[PDB]
Design an enzyme around this catalytic site. Structure first.
Site, PDB file in Angstrom:
ATOM      1  N   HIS A 281     -14.329  -3.662   3.823  1.00  0.00           N
ATOM      2  CA  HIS A 281     -14.614  -5.069   3.535  1.00  0.00           C
ATOM      3  C   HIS A 281     -15.746  -5.529   4.463  1.00  0.00           C
ATOM      4  O   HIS A 281     -16.385  -6.554   4.219  1.00  0.00           O
ATOM      5  CB  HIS A 281     -13.394  -5.947   3.818  1.00  0.00           C
TER       6      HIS A 281
ATOM      7  N   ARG B 145     -10.542   1.282   4.072  1.00  0.00           N
ATOM      8  CA  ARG B 145      -9.639   1.957   3.136  1.00  0.00           C
ATOM      9  C   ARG B 145     -10.128   3.333   2.712  1.00  0.00           C
ATOM     10  O   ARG B 145     -11.336   3.604   2.662  1.00  0.00           O
ATOM     11  CB  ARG B 145      -9.502   1.159   1.836  1.00  0.00           C
TER      12      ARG B 145
ATOM     13  N   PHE C 145     -15.774  -4.750  -1.616  1.00  0.00           N
ATOM     14  CA  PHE C 145     -15.869  -3.586  -0.748  1.00  0.00           C
ATOM     15  C   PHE C 145     -17.266  -2.987  -0.850  1.00  0.00           C
ATOM     16  O   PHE C 145     -17.979  -3.202  -1.836  1.00  0.00           O
ATOM     17  CB  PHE C 145     -14.878  -2.497  -1.173  1.00  0.00           C
TER      18      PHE C 145
ATOM     19  N   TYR D 129       0.849  -1.182   0.000  1.00  0.00           N
ATOM     20  CA  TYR D 129       0.000   0.000   0.000  1.00  0.00           C
ATOM     21  C   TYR D 129       0.887   1.235   0.000  1.00  0.00           C
ATOM     22  O   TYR D 129       1.946   1.245   0.626  1.00  0.00           O
ATOM     23  CB  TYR D 129      -0.904   0.019   1.238  1.00  0.00           C
TER      24      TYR D 129
HETATM   25  N1  LIG Z   1     -12.173  -5.539  -4.355  1.00  0.00           N
HETATM   26  C1  LIG Z   1     -11.256  -4.911  -5.104  1.00  0.00           C
HETATM   27  N2  LIG Z   1      -9.976  -5.316  -5.128  1.00  0.00           N
HETATM   28  C2  LIG Z   1      -9.167  -4.537  -5.908  1.00  0.00           C
HETATM   29  C3  LIG Z   1      -9.522  -3.432  -6.642  1.00  0.00           C
HETATM   30  N3  LIG Z   1      -8.426  -2.899  -7.303  1.00  0.00           N
HETATM   31  C4  LIG Z   1      -7.441  -3.678  -6.972  1.00  0.00           C
HETATM   32  N4  LIG Z   1      -7.808  -4.705  -6.133  1.00  0.00           N
HETATM   33  C5  LIG Z   1      -6.972  -5.849  -5.689  1.00  0.00           C
HETATM   34  O1  LIG Z   1      -7.490  -6.927  -6.465  1.00  0.00           O
HETATM   35  C6  LIG Z   1      -7.420  -8.151  -5.716  1.00  0.00           C
HETATM   36  C7  LIG Z   1      -8.807  -8.807  -5.598  1.00  0.00           C
HETATM   37  O2  LIG Z   1      -9.725  -8.213  -4.653  1.00  0.00           O
HETATM   38  C8  LIG Z   1      -6.824  -7.823  -4.347  1.00  0.00           C
HETATM   39  O3  LIG Z   1      -5.435  -8.054  -4.471  1.00  0.00           O
HETATM   40  C9  LIG Z   1      -7.153  -6.324  -4.246  1.00  0.00           C
HETATM   41  O4  LIG Z   1      -6.230  -5.604  -3.370  1.00  0.00           O
HETATM   42  P1  LIG Z   1      -6.616  -5.244  -1.850  1.00  0.00           P
HETATM   43  O5  LIG Z   1      -6.881  -6.550  -1.214  1.00  0.00           O
HETATM   44  O6  LIG Z   1      -5.412  -4.551  -1.383  1.00  0.00           O
HETATM   45  O7  LIG Z   1      -7.828  -4.418  -1.973  1.00  0.00           O
HETATM   46  C10 LIG Z   1     -10.873  -3.005  -6.636  1.00  0.00           C
HETATM   47  O8  LIG Z   1     -11.321  -2.059  -7.293  1.00  0.00           O
HETATM   48  N5  LIG Z   1     -11.688  -3.808  -5.825  1.00  0.00           N
END
Ligand SMILES: Nc1nc2c(ncn2[C@@H]2O[C@H](CO)[C@@H](O)[C@H]2OP(=O)(O)O)c(=O)[nH]1
Ligand SMILES: Nc1nc2c(ncn2[C@@H]2O[C@H](CO)[C@@H](O)[C@H]2OP(=O)(O)O)c(=O)[nH]1
Ligand SMILES: Nc1nc2c(ncn2[C@@H]2O[C@H](CO)[C@@H](O)[C@H]2OP(=O)(O)O)c(=O)[nH]1
Ligand SMILES: Nc1nc2c(ncn2[C@@H]2O[C@H](CO)[C@@H](O)[C@H]2OP(=O)(O)O)c(=O)[nH]1
Ligand SMILES: Nc1nc2c(ncn2[C@@H]2O[C@H](CO)[C@@H](O)[C@H]2OP(=O)(O)O)c(=O)[nH]1
Ligand SMILES: [Ca+2]
Ligand SMILES: [Ca+2]
Lengths: 104, 104, 104, 104
Positions: free
Chosen positions: D92, D77, D100, D38
């Site tokens: 989440h 987030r 999300f 991040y």
């Molecule tokens: N749910 C979600 N995950 C995202 C998005 N963009 C990137 N991701 C990443 O895509 C993968 C599937 O959810 C995860 O690695 C997530 O990272 P984070 O877990 O850090 O959100 C988004 O718009 N929505």
């Protein structure tokens, strides 16, 4: 008697009024004391709900009853504005970092 | 129970609070005790990432629970600031060159 | 132990208690000894923060361990009140003029 | 006093603004922290109708009030864009899988 409770420190209306008067006077003359140069602007980062308008200034109020003169400020502060109106009484006691909580 | 551990010394929050209160009272009055004049300024040469602001002062905390009053200070110290806020608990124990390491 | 440090003089709790008992006995009997008529009223011009109430009386405490009986008073004094409560242990050593500083 | 609510976590505008500033600064320097690296690009798989333009980046906001520094990210987030504009606050909590939902 115990109008303002800052942690375990108890302040009456007179105590606050005396400290405020001293702090306002220095502000008026443009003078400061202590390593942190009191009185100085209080930006209200904590977002307290003050009834009086800004700008705000913080000044130490001592549990001993003496008027702050540059020594150790302690944890408690009186907050006043440009009209010498009392915004509130705050303290570091009970808060984390350099944050404040209001005395109840 | 064991809030802070300095080497083999176990300290509770109450132990730290009592030590800090005694040290701060002396600082506020402008008095010191011992050959090393406690409480004295702690410049943070070790670079501890304290959450509260300086100036910092170190005051001995004794393993026996007794409040320091002039003898040998030992290895343990409570560090507090001018606002009477606890910055941390540190010790000479385990530090090279008799510097300081944090108590966990 | 070295419970009280008046300049370079070191006193234990027993030393203080013994001296105090002696002075309070004379106070109770309404008698005095020494050029300065001890024990006599301690006015607290220094404005010390005593945990017990006034009136206060000062009585010399000797480094030798002897109980004062009219000779040279020295620089150290024990201060007690009407109820034979210990207010504090003070000394001329380290102070200016005819002032007193608290023993630590 | 509760600008954003992610499940049971209450966030003020200051909490969000402080979290965003820290996350944006890291993006600006090209640095990332934590096992999930991040801040990183948020592709908007949820299809939020954001008021500001992409690309979006996600960064953890902690209920404890501390700035995320690489540890457990939690469920919440803050989403900001390249112009340092807040797109929204998401979580989440209340969503299945790794999806999300918006904090209102
Ligand atoms: N749910 C979600 N995950 C995202 C998005 N963009 C990137 N991701 C990443 O895509 C993968 C599937 O959810 C995860 O690695 C997530 O990272 P984070 O877990 O850090 O959100 C988004 O718009 N929505
Ligand atoms: N906590 C806090 N500090 C303030 C505020 N306004 C000014 N400050 C100053 O901002 C810095 C970080 O808190 C410090 O220099 C602090 O001054 P004092 O340390 O004298 O309070 C305020 O509203 N809250
Ligand atoms: N290890 C250490 N010693 C300090 C610190 N601040 C002050 N001191 C030491 O405390 C003593 C009394 O002030 C001095 O020897 C001083 O060291 P210096 O002589 O190196 O400044 C500090 O942050 N770390
Ligand atoms: N470990 C240890 N350090 C001590 C003791 N007494 C004093 N010191 C520290 O040793 C340094 C050099 O003699 C002193 O400046 C003092 O620094 P502090 O005040 O920072 O502890 C003691 O009994 N044990
Ligand atoms: N410094 C000081 N002297 C006092 C006080 N009360 C009484 N005294 C006496 O006032 C005079 C001036 O100091 C002396 O006679 C002193 O007595 P001792 O010398 O016996 O202490 C007091 O509160 N402070
Ligand atoms: Ca013991
Ligand atoms: Ca959509």
């Amino acid at each position: 008697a115990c109008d303002y409770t800052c942690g375990s420190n108890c302040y009456s209306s007179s105590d606050v009024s005396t400290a405020q008067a001293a702090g306002y006077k220095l502000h008026e003359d443009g003078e400061t004391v202590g390593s942190n140069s009191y009185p100085h602007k209080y930006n209200n980062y904590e977002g307290f709900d003050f009834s009086v308008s800004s700008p705000y200034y913080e000044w130490p109020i001592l549990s001993s009853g003496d008027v702050y003169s540059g020594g150790s400020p302690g944890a408690d502060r009186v907050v006043f504005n440009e009209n010498n109106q009392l915004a509130g009484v705050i303290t570091h006691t009970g808060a984390s970092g350099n944050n404040f909580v209001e005395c109840t």
